[PDB]
Amino acid sequence: GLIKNPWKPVVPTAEGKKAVLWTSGWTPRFKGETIYLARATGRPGESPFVK
Amino acid sequence: CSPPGETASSEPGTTPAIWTGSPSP
Amino acid sequence: QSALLRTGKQLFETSCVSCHGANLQGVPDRGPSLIGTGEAAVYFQVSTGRMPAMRGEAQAPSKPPHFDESQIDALGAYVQANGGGPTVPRDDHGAVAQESLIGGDVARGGDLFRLNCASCHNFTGKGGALSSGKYAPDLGDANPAQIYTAMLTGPQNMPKFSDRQLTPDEKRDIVAYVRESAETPSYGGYGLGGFGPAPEGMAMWIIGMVAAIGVAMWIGSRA
Amino acid sequence: CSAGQISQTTTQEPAVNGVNAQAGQVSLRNVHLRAPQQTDYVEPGTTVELLFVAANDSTEGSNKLKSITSDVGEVTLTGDSTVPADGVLIVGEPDGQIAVTAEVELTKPITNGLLYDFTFTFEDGETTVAVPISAGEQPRRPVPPAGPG
Numbered sequence: 319g320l321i322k323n324p325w326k327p328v329v330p331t332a333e334g335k336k337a338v339l340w341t342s343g344w345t346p347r348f349k350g351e352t353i354y355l356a357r358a359t360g361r362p363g364e365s366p367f368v369k
Numbered sequence: 370c371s372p373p374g375e376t377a378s379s380e381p382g383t384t385p386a387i388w389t390g391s392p393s394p
Numbered sequence: 395q396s397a398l399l400r401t402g403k404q405l406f407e408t409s410c411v412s413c414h415g416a417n418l419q420g421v422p423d424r425g426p427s428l429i430g431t432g433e434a435a436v437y438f439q440v441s442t443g444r445m446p447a448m449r450g451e452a453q454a455p456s457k458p459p460h461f462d463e464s465q466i467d468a469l470g471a472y473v474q475a476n477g478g479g480p481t482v483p484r485d486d487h488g489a490v491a492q493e494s495l496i497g498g499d500v501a502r503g504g505d506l507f508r509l510n511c512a513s514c515h516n517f518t519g520k521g522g523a524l525s526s527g528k529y530a531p532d533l534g535d536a537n538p539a540q541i542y543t544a545m546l547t548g549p550q551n552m553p554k555f556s557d558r559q560l561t562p563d564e565k566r567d568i569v570a571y572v573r574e575s576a577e578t579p580s581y582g583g584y585g586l587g588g589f590g591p592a593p594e595g596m597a598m599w600i601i602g603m604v605a606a607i608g609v610a611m612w613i614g615s616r617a
Numbered sequence: 618c619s620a621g622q623i624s625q626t627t628t629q630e631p632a633v634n635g636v637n638a639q640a641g642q643v644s645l646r647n648v649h650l651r652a653p654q655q656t657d658y659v660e661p662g663t664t665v666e667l668l669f670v671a672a673n674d675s676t677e678g679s680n681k682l683k684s685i686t687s688d689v690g691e692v693t694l695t696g697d698s699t700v701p702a703d704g705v706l707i708v709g710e711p712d713g714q715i716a717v718t719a720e721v722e723l724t725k726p727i728t729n730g731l732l733y734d735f736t737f738t739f740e741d742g743e744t745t746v747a748v749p750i751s752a753g754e755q756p757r758r759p760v761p762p763a764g765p766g
């Protein structure tokens with residue numbers, strides 16, 4: 319029950335499911351998806367990230 | 370050893386195009 | 395004020411020209427141009443005593459100031475007149491702002507400090523080593539205006555934080571966190587410097603273990 | 618070992634947004650464009666401002682500024698563009714400055730983040746700079762509130 323395949327494709331991307339280590343929040347989820355560089359405002363909730 | 374996929378280039382590069390962005394999440 | 399401008403130039407001429415130039419343009423391999431650095435840069439660099447610098451090494455240290463408050467204002471006014479730049483916040487009476495720079499949200503300030511500042515200054519502004527002879531200093535002696543202008547001007551190798559990257563209210567929250575984490579007492583005994591495992595392990599070996607071995611020697615026998 | 622000929626403090630550059638440049642015997646300090654922006658570009662036909670300080674390295678003679686050209690538009694110099702014996706010439710009034718001016722009439726668009734080439738010509742010396750745009754002491758522009766997603 320402890321053993322897990324690390325390379326099982328589980329992460330949705332623009333070219334199908336991929337293993338976790340190949341991806342991040344910067345991996346596009348569809349072609350042309352707009353991902354902004356957002357900065358931390360330091361206030362928890364109430365827009366913690368802004369453009 | 371040095372990582373084979375890491376080399377300096379001399380090509381200058383171009384200014385990136387303005388992002389437009391496709392629809393459909 | 396023309397008097398303040400001529401006093402600043404007069405002070406500048408026998409203290410800063412050898413490294414910065416007669417026209418504030420810099421002397422190559424000796425000191426940078428000061429054009430556009432602003433009054434805030436002068437305030438930070440001279441009120442913490444870093445300027446005038448005494449030699450070239452890895453990092454210029456802070457030390458006792460060579461000028462008083464009015465002379466610092468005069469020097470900052472003279473530099474401001476050559477290129478402008480950021481200025482030091484003031485209060486109603488025209489004094490350099492200190493208490494009004496303490497922001498009201500210290501939890502936001504702590505979160506911002508841990509994201510932006512603790513990498514170089516440590517969890518509680520105790521200082522940290524940088525690359526080769528450089529170091530982010532202990533923050534416990536800076537007054538609020540010094541903290542504010544340090545963020546505003548980006549000294550030596552400290553990143554520059556513009557008023558657009560960190561708005562004035564964010565900066566005031568950060569200075570509140572920096573000041574309060576310097577003035578809060580330790581809760582669990584003597585704070586041991588605030589660095590954590592290294593001084594704690596030093597205290598175990600030189601106090602706890604020395605005591606335990608001395609007691610063992612007292613109870614036990616020799617030979 | 619940190620106090621030798623290659624020293625870390627002494628080669629440090631000013632922590633400002635403008636650029637330094639050597640035009641023969643003239644030092645060009647804090648050269649930058651003022652150009653408040655609203656969208657991805659500042660469009661052609663806008664008038665932006667080119668600011669700098671010119672410092673006379675020589676202390677014997679005088680010097681004068683001619684013919685600033687660029688491939689972003691045309692530059693008009695207004696005022697007495699002469700830089701004195703061992704003095705400065707402040708061109709434009711920068712952000713926190715409480716009348717030589719360089720007005721750039723744009724022909725192609727510009728955007729904050731990129732560098733743009735300008736050619737300064739003095740009566741002794743002439744060089745190209747690659748000038749940035751600096752928002753100065755202007756506040757951060759509001760960002761429209763994001764919804765819930």
Ligand SMILES: CCCCCCCCCCCCCCCC(=O)OC[C@H]1O[C@H](O[C@@H]2[C@H](O)[C@@H](O)[C@H](O)[C@@H](O[C@H]3O[C@H](CO)[C@@H](O)[C@H](O)[C@@H]3O)[C@@H]2OP(=O)(O)OC[C@@H](COC(=O)CCCCCCCC[C@H](C)CCCCCCCC)OC(=O)CCCCCCCCCCCCCCC)[C@@H](O)[C@@H](O)[C@@H]1O
Nearest residue numbers: 532534535576577579580583584585586587596600601605
């Ligand atoms: C079995 C027994 C076991 C138990 C042992 C218990 C012993 C410990 C004492 C008990 C605790 C008391 C009860 C409650 C705690 C308390 O009431 O506490 C008050 C405050 O106290 C500290 O506040 C200092 C000021 O009061 C503040 O004003 C100031 O702000 C603060 O500044 C910090 O914070 C700033 C952020 O703002 C930064 O800017 C700044 O830089 C710094 O970090 C200060 O802290 P700091 O300088 O750490 O300590 C300085 C200490 C001084 O050192 C100490 O006594 C520490 C001693 C323990 C350390 C042991 C190290 C061992 C080293 C190794 C042996 C290495 C050598 C081996 C290699 C050799 C090589 C050769 C081969 O003060 C002094 O008394 C100085 C004068 C004289 C000191 C003497 C006091 C007692 C011992 C004396 C010894 C005999 C002779 C006298 C000595 C001069 C901070 O903790 C605060 O949180 C805390 O609030």
Ligand SMILES: CC(C)=CCC/C(C)=C/CC/C(C)=C/CC/C(C)=C/CC/C(C)=C/CC/C(C)=C/CC/C(C)=C/CC/C(C)=C/CC/C(C)=C/CC1=C(C)C(=O)c2ccccc2C1=O
Nearest residue numbers: 591592593594595596597598599600601602603604605607
């Ligand atoms: C004695 C011995 C280790 C023999 C084993 C030989 C052997 C089989 C070797 C093969 C294994 C290998 C390759 C070992 C290499 C070493 C290694 C990597 C060790 C792994 C872990 C390990 C086994 C460590 C044990 C080390 C050890 C025996 C330590 C105790 C030393 C002694 C005798 C201390 C008593 C003297 C004493 C109380 C002095 C006063 C207080 C002082 C100054 C203590 C020194 C001191 C210490 C020891 C700290 O750890 C420390 C940590 C953080 C801050 C400060 C200190 C500090 O000051």
Ligand SMILES: CC(C)=CCC/C(C)=C/CC/C(C)=C/CC/C(C)=C/CC/C(C)=C\CC/C(C)=C/CC/C(C)=C/CC/C(C)=C/CC/C(C)=C/CC1=C(C)C(=O)c2ccccc2C1=O
Nearest residue numbers: 520584585586587588589590591592593594595596597600
């Ligand atoms: C691998 C590595 C790290 C290499 C570097 C090693 C190195 C060069 C260290 C020495 C640093 C020094 C001492 C610099 C100055 C130059 C100098 C004087 C060198 C020695 C010259 C010499 C051999 C002749 C004189 C005679 C002699 C032997 C001198 C005594 C040297 C002494 C006693 C110095 C201490 C050495 C040392 C590295 C100790 C570490 C102590 C530690 C780990 C403590 C942690 C600790 C800290 C850091 C706190 O901030 C703190 C705050 C509040 C309470 C407690 C603490 C606390 O314990």
Ligand code: HEC
Nearest residue numbers: 409410413425431435436445446447454626627629631632
């Ligand atoms: C040579 C030994 C110097 C003397 C004398 C003075 N300054 Fe200096 N200064 C020098 C260097 C090498 C540097 C750069 C790295 C550093 O230590 O910060 C500086 C820096 C400044 C700054 C900061 C510039 C920035 O980019 O914002 C300022 C405002 C400054 N120096 C001012 C100043 C004044 C007012 C001096 C006379 C009291 C003075 N400096 C002396 C080198 C040297």
Ligand code: HEC
Nearest residue numbers: 456510511514529530531536540541544549550551552553
């Ligand atoms: C590492 C790259 C740093 C980061 C990130 C921050 N700081 Fe810093 N700071 C750093 C250095 C190397 C120095 C010394 C520069 C000098 O010219 O000597 C500083 C200085 C300060 C100071 C002045 C401290 C004084 O001596 O009293 C303050 C108040 C300060 N730094 C605060 C500060 C804050 C609030 C930061 C987060 C925005 C921050 N620093 C980031 C290195 C680095």
